[PDB]
Design a protein around this ligand. Structure first.
Ligand code: MN
Ligand code: MN
Lengths: 152, 151
């Protein structure tokens, strides 16, 4: 079953989102898991406020923390993200050839990238995770200026 | 529209050449305000300098710009010595940068170049001989590094 590790992947992604939230950042987390054995290649969260970073989205920080892997490794992984990916994080999934992307929720944010991934041959799974929806809803409500000056 | 294109590509090439001297992939970029030609940021590929999986030349350029107001990006041109991969294409789209000027797409090209135009962005390929030469040399001298990356 392709979804064997999906509860583990989204649980780690949410923990990263909650950790980033406690650090004062945007609560978006992710992790990359080897589909073969469920091992975690890397995990991360949005670093826009922790590091003043314009590019360290949750998915980008996750892939950066994985390090430079062999191209064959990416081809049998799933990228977990608590929030539907923007066009840049979509492009990163495509560029590395990660075949599966499991999305916590796309209620608080959605780009054309979710559909573009499927156009480019990737599998996209939206789990509608209530924990992810709640923590991002709170961020948008409490920090609307930070959100709408960013990808909001 | 193309008033600053020689300035932008010259800075992008200098970043690529600087990255070459540091031992990295010779891909450079810069972001320029279309209004007055001021440089918002510049950078080069940091895959080998920092062991980075994501700091492509275009990504490093945007990182070096810092967190800007969304209105600022909407009137810029991103200059890159090499045609962008799907990730750097997505960064241009996500920030709404309306213009991308590409040094060359002979040594590398992805579906992103056409996708940028599909999404309403202007793409200009200048066929810069300096950029073609320095990337041709890198591919020849470091084929393992190139083909284990986006090659
Ligand atoms: Mn993103
Ligand atoms: Mn790239």
């Amino acid at each position: 079953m392709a979804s064997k590790w999906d509860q583990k992947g989204m649980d780690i992604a949410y923990e990263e989102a909650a950790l980033g939230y406690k650090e004062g950042g945007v609560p978006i987390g992710g992790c990359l898991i080897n589909n073969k054995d469920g091992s975690v290649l890397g995990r991360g969260h949005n670093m826009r406020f922790q590091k003043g970073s314009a590019t360290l989205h949750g998915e980008i920080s996750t892939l950066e923390n994985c390090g430079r892997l062999e191209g064959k490794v990416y081809k049998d992984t799933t990228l977990y993200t608590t929030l539907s990916p923007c066009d840049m994080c979509t492009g990163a999934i495509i560029m590395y050839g990660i075949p599966r992307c499991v999305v916590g929720e796309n209620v608080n944010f959605k780009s054309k990238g979710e559909k573009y991934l499927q156009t480019r041959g990737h599998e996209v799974v939206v789990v509608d995770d209530e924990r992810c929806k709640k923590i991002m809803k709170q961020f948008i409500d409490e920090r609307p200026q930070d959100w709408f000056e960013d990808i909001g």
